Design an enzyme around this catalytic site. Structure first.
Site, short mmCIF file in Angstrom:
data_model
loop_
_atom_site.label_atom_id
_atom_site.label_comp_id
_atom_site.label_asym_id
_atom_site.label_seq_id
_atom_site.Cartn_x
_atom_site.Cartn_y
_atom_site.Cartn_z
N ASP A 28 17.22 7.87 -57.40
CA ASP A 28 18.35 8.43 -58.12
C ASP A 28 17.91 8.91 -59.49
O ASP A 28 16.77 9.37 -59.63
CB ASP A 28 19.47 7.36 -58.17
CG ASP A 28 20.93 7.78 -58.31
OD1 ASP A 28 21.70 7.54 -57.34
OD2 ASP A 28 21.29 8.35 -59.35
N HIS A 66 24.26 7.83 -63.42
CA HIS A 66 24.57 7.75 -61.99
C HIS A 66 23.73 6.71 -61.27
O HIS A 66 24.23 5.90 -60.51
CB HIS A 66 24.41 9.15 -61.41
CG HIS A 66 24.72 9.32 -59.97
ND1 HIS A 66 23.80 9.11 -58.97
CD2 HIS A 66 25.86 9.74 -59.36
CE1 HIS A 66 24.34 9.40 -57.81
NE2 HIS A 66 25.58 9.77 -58.01
N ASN A 83 30.07 14.91 -50.57
CA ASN A 83 31.39 15.02 -51.12
C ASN A 83 32.05 16.38 -50.97
O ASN A 83 32.78 16.84 -51.85
CB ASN A 83 31.36 14.70 -52.63
CG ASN A 83 30.91 13.32 -52.99
OD1 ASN A 83 30.82 12.42 -52.18
ND2 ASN A 83 30.67 13.14 -54.29
N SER A 129 28.37 8.74 -53.18
CA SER A 129 27.32 8.06 -53.92
C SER A 129 27.66 6.62 -54.23
O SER A 129 26.75 5.82 -54.44
CB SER A 129 27.06 8.73 -55.28
OG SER A 129 26.30 9.89 -55.21
#
Ligand SMILES: [Ca+2]
Ligand SMILES: [Ca+2]
Length: 279
Positions: free
Chosen positions: A39, A69, A161, A224
């Site tokens: 990530d 994130h 998404n 996520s």
């Protein structure tokens, strides 16, 4: 063990019904497992990680998570308050820049790195990788995810998404990994969650409280956020000896809450990650 007033997603993981607030889990808590969070990095100094997080690779100028994130996702895997597997070891691999973006070549390299690096780490209960990322279909990205899984790592990836079929996204569309859709606290498919036959499981993804950079916390939404619930669940179940890296996704599907979610398109699994904890 029981965590009162837990984030809704943790409570949901340990209940056959929505609306509860206590997270029930075995005290082993993923001890002896390892989860690589591929990530934007992990702010390992966050008090919520308790010294159990460390950066092991960066593809950028620094290993710092300048976004948040990756720290959030890592917190859902394994932070004290916000994590599924509260005693796991977390390893950060920074393949995404501080805007949350990354080239596929870099993402691929990070997967290959984990497949090798795990041979240098002591992870007696097994190894998991959480990939809260993706973009359009790429056979090369899917192959990298397939390699990582084949190497003996439980790979969990976000469905995406786009409110669309995950067949058109990668690494979501790689069949051999664990592709994770998102749900909300009322057991609806999250508005943005991808769907389709390639999904293996759903996890909590709307309004998920976790760690953030600057030693902070916040609630955000996405596939996520669902992904690390499944990654952490896998680590937890692997520590308990209930499953293995090769079989954990299937085990999670076998033991999931079935038929609870709404707005699941026909042909998509109606399966919500569940720890089946029995005190
Ligand atoms: Ca139910
Ligand atoms: Ca799969």
């Amino acid at each position: 063990a029981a965590q009162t007033n837990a984030p809704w997603g943790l409570a949901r993981i340990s209940s056959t019904s929505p609306g509860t607030s206590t997270y029930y889990y075995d005290e082993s808590a993923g001890q002896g497992s390892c989860v690589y969070v591929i990530d934007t990095g992990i702010e390992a100094s966050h008090p919520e990680f308790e010294g159990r997080a460390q950066m092991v690779k960066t593809y950028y100028y620094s290993s710092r998570d300048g976004n948040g994130h990756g720290t959030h996702c890592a917190g859902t895997v394994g932070s004290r308050t916000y994590g599924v597997a509260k005693k796991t070891q977390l390893f950060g691999v920074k393949v995404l820049d501080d805007n949350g973006s990354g080239q596929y070549s870099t993402i691929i390299a990070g997967m290959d790195f984990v497949a090798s690096d795990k041979n240098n780490r002591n992870c007696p209960k097994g190894v998991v990788a959480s990939l809260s990322l993706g973009g359009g279909y790429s056979s090369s990205v899917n192959s990298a995810a397939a390699r990582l899984q084949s190497s003996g790592v439980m790979v969990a990836v976000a469905a995406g998404n786009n409110n669309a079929d995950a067949r058109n996204y990668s690494p979501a569309s790689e069949p051999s990994v664990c592709t994770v859709g998102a749900s909300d606290r009322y057991d609806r498919r999250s508005s943005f969650s991808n769907y389709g036959s390639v999904l293996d499981i759903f996890g909590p993804g709307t309004d998920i409280l976790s760690t953030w950079i600057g030693g902070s916390t916040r609630s955000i939404s996405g596939t996520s956020m669902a992904t690390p619930h499944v990654a952490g669940l896998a680590a937890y179940l692997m520590t308990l000896g209930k499953t293995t890296a090769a079989s954990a996704c299937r085990y999670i599907a076998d033991t999931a809450n079935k038929g609870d979610l709404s707005n699941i398109p026909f042909g998509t699994v109606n399966l919500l990650a569940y720890n089946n904890y029995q005190a």
